[PDB]
Amino acid sequence: FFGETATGKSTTKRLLKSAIGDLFVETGQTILTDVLDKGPNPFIANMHLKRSVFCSELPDFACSGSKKIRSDNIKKLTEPCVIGRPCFSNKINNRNHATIIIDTNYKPVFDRIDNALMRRIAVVRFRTHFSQPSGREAAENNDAYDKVKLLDEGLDGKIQNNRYRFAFLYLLVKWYKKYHIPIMKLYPTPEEIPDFAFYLKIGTLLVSSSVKHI
Amino acid sequence: LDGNKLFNIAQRILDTNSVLLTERGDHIVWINNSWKFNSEEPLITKLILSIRHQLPKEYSSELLCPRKRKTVEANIRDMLVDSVETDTYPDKLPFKNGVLDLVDGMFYSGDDAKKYTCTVSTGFKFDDTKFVEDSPEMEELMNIINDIQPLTDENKKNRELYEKTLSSCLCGATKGCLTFFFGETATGKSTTKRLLKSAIGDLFVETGQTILTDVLDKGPNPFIANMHLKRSVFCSELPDFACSGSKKIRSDNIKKLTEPCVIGRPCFSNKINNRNHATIIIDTNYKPVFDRIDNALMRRIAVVRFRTHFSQPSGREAAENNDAYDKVKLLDEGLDGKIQNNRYRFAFLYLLVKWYKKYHIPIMKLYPTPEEIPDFAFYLKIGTLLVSSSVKHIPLMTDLSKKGYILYDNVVTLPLTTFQQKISKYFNSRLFGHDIESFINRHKKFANVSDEYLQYIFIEDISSP
Amino acid sequence: LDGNKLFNIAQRILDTNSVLLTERGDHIVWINNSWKFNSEEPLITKLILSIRHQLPKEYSSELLCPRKRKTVEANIRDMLVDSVETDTYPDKLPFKNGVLDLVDGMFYS
Amino acid sequence: FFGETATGKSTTKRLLKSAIGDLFVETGQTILTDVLDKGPNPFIANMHLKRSVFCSELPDFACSGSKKIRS
DNA sequence: TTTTTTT
Ligand SMILES: Nc1ncnc2c1ncn2[C@@H]1O[C@H](COP(=O)(O)OP(=O)(O)OP(=O)(O)O)[C@@H](O)[C@H]1O
Ligand SMILES: Nc1ncnc2c1ncn2[C@@H]1O[C@H](COP(=O)(O)OP(=O)(O)OP(=O)(O)O)[C@@H](O)[C@H]1O
Numbered sequence: 113f114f115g116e117t118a119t120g121k122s123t124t125k126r127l128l129k130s131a132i133g134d135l136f137v138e139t140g141q142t143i144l145t146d147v148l149d150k151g152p153n154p155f156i157a158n159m160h161l162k163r164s165v166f167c168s169e170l171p172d173f174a175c176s177g178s179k180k181i182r183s184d185n186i187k188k189l190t191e192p193c194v195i196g197r198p199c200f201s202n203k204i205n206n207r208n209h210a211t212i213i214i215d216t217n218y219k220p221v222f223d224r225i226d227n228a229l230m231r232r233i234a235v236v237r238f239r240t241h242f243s244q245p246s247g248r249e250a251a252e253n254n255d256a257y258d259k260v261k262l263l264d265e266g267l268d269g270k271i272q273n274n275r276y277r278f279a280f281l282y283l284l285v286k287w288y289k290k291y292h293i294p295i296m297k298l299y300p301t302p303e304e305i306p307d308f309a310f311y312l313k314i315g316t317l318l319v320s321s322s323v324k325h326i
Numbered sequence: 327l328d329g330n331k332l333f334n335i336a337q338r339i340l341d342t343n344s345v346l347l348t349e350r351g352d353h354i355v356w357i358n359n360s361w362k363f364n365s366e367e368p369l370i371t372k373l374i375l376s377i378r379h380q381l382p383k384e385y386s387s388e389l390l391c392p393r394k395r396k397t398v399e400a401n402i403r404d405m406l407v408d409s410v411e412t413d414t415y416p417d418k419l420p421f422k423n424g425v426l427d428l429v430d431g432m433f434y435s436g437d438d439a440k441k442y443t444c445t446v447s448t449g450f451k452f453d454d455t456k457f458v459e460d461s462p463e464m465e466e467l468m469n470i471i472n473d474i475q476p477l478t479d480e481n482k483k484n485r486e487l488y489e490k491t492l493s494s495c496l497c498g499a500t501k502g503c504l505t506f507f508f509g510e511t512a513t514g515k516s517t518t519k520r521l522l523k524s525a526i527g528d529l530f531v532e533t534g535q536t537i538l539t540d541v542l543d544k545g546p547n548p549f550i551a552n553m554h555l556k557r558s559v560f561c562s563e564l565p566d567f568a569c570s571g572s573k574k575i576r577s578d579n580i581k582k583l584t585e586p587c588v589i590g591r592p593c594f595s596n597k598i599n600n601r602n603h604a605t606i607i608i609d610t611n612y613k614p615v616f617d618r619i620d621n622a623l624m625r626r627i628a629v630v631r632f633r634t635h636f637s638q639p640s641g642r643e644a645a646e647n648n649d650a651y652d653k654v655k656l657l658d659e660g661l662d663g664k665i666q667n668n669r670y671r672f673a674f675l676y677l678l679v680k681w682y683k684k685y686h687i688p689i690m691k692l693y694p695t696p697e698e699i700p701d702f703a704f705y706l707k708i709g710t711l712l713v714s715s716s717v718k719h720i721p722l723m724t725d726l727s728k729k730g731y732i733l734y735d736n737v738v739t740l741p742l743t744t745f746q747q748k749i750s751k752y753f754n755s756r757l758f759g760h761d762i763e764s765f766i767n768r769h770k771k772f773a774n775v776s777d778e779y780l781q782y783i784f785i786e787d788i789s790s791p
Numbered sequence: 792l793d794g795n796k797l798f799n800i801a802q803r804i805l806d807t808n809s810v811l812l813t814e815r816g817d818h819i820v821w822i823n824n825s826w827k828f829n830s831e832e833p834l835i836t837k838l839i840l841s842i843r844h845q846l847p848k849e850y851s852s853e854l855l856c857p858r859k860r861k862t863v864e865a866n867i868r869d870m871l872v873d874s875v876e877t878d879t880y881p882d883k884l885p886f887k888n889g890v891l892d893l894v895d896g897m898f899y900s
Numbered sequence: 901f902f903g904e905t906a907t908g909k910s911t912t913k914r915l916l917k918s919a920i921g922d923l924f925v926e927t928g929q930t931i932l933t934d935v936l937d938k939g940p941n942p943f944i945a946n947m948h949l950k951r952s953v954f955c956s957e958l959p960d961f962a963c964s965g966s967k968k969i970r971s
Numbered sequence: 972t973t974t975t976t977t978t
């Protein structure tokens with residue numbers, strides 16, 4: 113979930129949480145930046161049999177000393193069984209049923225880039241701003257916003273009371289019927305992240321040597 | 327003469343040989359035509375309740391009360407004072423309701439399967455109806471296998487090695503080397519892994535990479551503990567070592583994994599010894615590297631190459647240009663669903679049985695292939711081409727001085743200038759200059775202030791001119 | 792010649808397929824149209840107390856005392872020897888009091 | 901035991917192991933260069949009441965960076 | 972370059 117400040121990603125997360133109850137779970141950034149199988153890792157353990165996992169507030173990697181995202185973690189986070197150990201336990205097999213969503217303000221940075229990682233990334237953008245009456249004019253001069261609206265202060269509390277729970281559940285069911293009825297599958301979108309585009313364009317400009325060129 | 331009734335009941339239970347004590351201190355029971363052991367479950371009480379029927383009619387009423395069952399369990403645990411050995415037959419396959427003999431193909435059940443003390447099982451019942459050679463599912467499986475590994479004159483050796491490695495997982499002996507599944511994206515390694523897991527049931531296991539990077543004797547380690555008495559161990563997604571921060575695979579762990587017994591302890595249990603009966607498969611798209619190189623290390627490494635790409639219809643043209651692929655086919659989007667529902671379990675079992683009956687019946691052994699690792703290639707090239715000196719070179723001493731090997735201090739002394747000129751004209755400098763410098767600085771010696779030497783005579787110089 | 796009353800009660804409880812054993816080693820019970828499991832709570836005793844009503848009236852009085860419930864739980868634990876697999880349907884949404892079928896939208900309780 | 905390869909060292913080791921049964925034990929060269937007071941050391945408990953401790957396949961001291969076997 | 976975890 114990539115976008116600027118005050119674009120509604122958090123509201124979407126809260127709506128989904130209120131809709132799907134405790135099947136939703138939020139987990140820190142350790143799972144993307146360290147070894148999962150060393151020592152007790154309750155963050156991995158709590159991911160067992162969950163249906164949606166959220167990781168939020170990705171730091172900017174331009175800052176010095178900030179560790180980058182590891183490719184092996186992403187590869188390990190897509191197979192049906194993820195190896196992890198709870199505290200005071202020895203079971204090391206967890207069933208992976210969860211859709212993993214990350215809320216970030218900056219583009220991700222990976223240490224190593226290859227096709228295998230390239231086929232496991234999708235990005236959706238938010239380009240609307242919910243501002244205050246005072247800051248209405250300032251937002252008009254930003255290219256990161258395609259629309260500007262007025263903030264609603266009392267909306268958040270209404271979400272806390274589960275006012276839009278069953279309506280959102282019905283909408284989700286309708287969307288699931290619309291899309292995933294034949295078969296469920298997710299399609300990568302590598303043409304968004306910049307370095308991926310560099311890899312694509314460098315790949316398409318060369319052809320491997322063969323006997324036909326002799 | 328009629329003493330304690332519970333003692334007599336326990337004696338009768340012990341007389342049928344259904345409870346046994348292992349060497350390391352485990353109790354194994356015989357329930358539902360299978361040997362089971364579980365330290366967190368009251369298996370002895372379950373066995374007592376189950377075999378209550380076989381006892382005379384005057385004992386079931388006593389056995390119905392749980393306290394009497396506890397007393398009988400205590401008596402039984404007290405009587406037995408001897409250990410036994412288990413899993414002494416490497417050519418048997420244990421199932422949930424019997425044991426299959428891989429030699430004759432006959433399937434045993436009941437007491438016949440009891441004589442072989444197999445403490446692990448595939449976890450599912452063996453069905454003879456589906457264990458047939460002619461079936462549409464078998465044809466589909468054969469087509470898929472041919473698609474993944476085409477049978478050609480170029481791929482015949484690779485396919486033979488692949489078949490041997492896959493069939494090795496059935497036997498319960500100790501394997502001398504592990505196998506690397508190397509390939510590109512969407513090549514079929516995961517499909518093979520899932521098919522093997524579905525075929526062999528509970529005998530399959532997957533663990534983390536910590537076994538190849540960290541020590542094993544420090545503290546409890548359930549990852550090693552779960553490996554005990556397993557038939558196949560799988561690990562995946564080895565990180566690229568080109569980037570900084572990657573940790574090399576320690577050869578000490580590789581040496582320790584090739585031993586019949588392995589150290590490691592679970593939580594809240596003082597069980598430190600485990601039997602190594604498993605074939606280790608590491609699948610990755612990056613060739614591994616190691617800190618140290620020696621003959622004993624590359625004598626236990628094998629590599630299998632996957633070179634068939636299953637791509638999207640839109641990506642067929644792009645994949646065709648890439649040289650890493652030899653065949654580009656379509657992308658079946660329903661294969662994973664069928665595999666997960668065990669649509670090819672018994673067909674794969676039959677195919678593996680045939681492969682075992684074609685390769686491993688005379689003798690089980692695995693042969694390493696150290697000619698594919700880039701790190702081992704340079705060291706092997708030294709070993710084949712560059713040889714050291716010995717006392718047998720005394721008759722050649724005159725020619726040795728002619729080329730430069732002076733017998734200072736009763737040892738050959740070839741100047742490093744001549745030696746580096748030789749290696750530069752033979753060993754290409756640009757490819758492995760750093761490795762050549764490491765060779766020079768490793769076994770460096772000086773005869774005197776201006777006679778720096780290495781006691782290695784290149785093979786055209788060992789030949790008498 | 793009927794034997795232990797508690798054993799008969801435990802057999803009757805087991806015959807309803809309300810408690811099952813999972814391959815991970817935890818027992819799952821069926822209370823209030825839901826499957827529950829917890830490694831730190833005695834769910835078996837809760838099941839025994841809750842489903843006491845449907846049993847014949849000569850057994851509820853026995854089921855009142857906690858010691859009898861503990862003995863019945865011991866019998867039930869002794870009788871369970873098999874394992875089953877859970878969560879094999881990827882298109883059902885489970886709630887606190889039923890399961891919703893995503894294919895049709897029908898709700899089963 | 902210093903000598904050429906395939907000179908019978910492995911044969912003698914196997915003969916000694918078969919002669920003394922479980923009294924034989926094999927340990928790596930790490931303890932020869934590592935600190936024995938740090939961390940758990942089940943190896944130190946291993947050669948207790950033993951009769952033969954074998955350290956074989958020693959690293960090449962010629963290799964740069966190899967840890968010297970502390971006296 | 973150990974601490975917590977584990978008994
Ligand atoms: N449709 C809407 N109309 C009015 N106000 C809205 C609307 N959607 C969201 N808001 C409000 O606008 C504010 C900004 O939303 P929010 O904080 O979720 O944005 P964000 O970009 O996800 O933020 P961050 O990434 O910093 O968490 C919130 O107070 C939210 O309640
Ligand atoms: N014979 C076949 N025909 C068509 N599709 C196939 C065939 N065999 C396998 N596939 C499909 O190929 C897809 C990719 O295979 P798989 O995931 O095993 O590749 P991989 O190279 O091991 O992947 P990665 O290394 O990225 O994990 C699977 O979804 C599977 O359905």
Ligand SMILES: [Mg+2]
Nearest residue numbers: 120121122123
């Ligand atoms: Mg927000």
Ligand SMILES: [Mg+2]
Nearest residue numbers: 514515516517
């Ligand atoms: Mg794969």
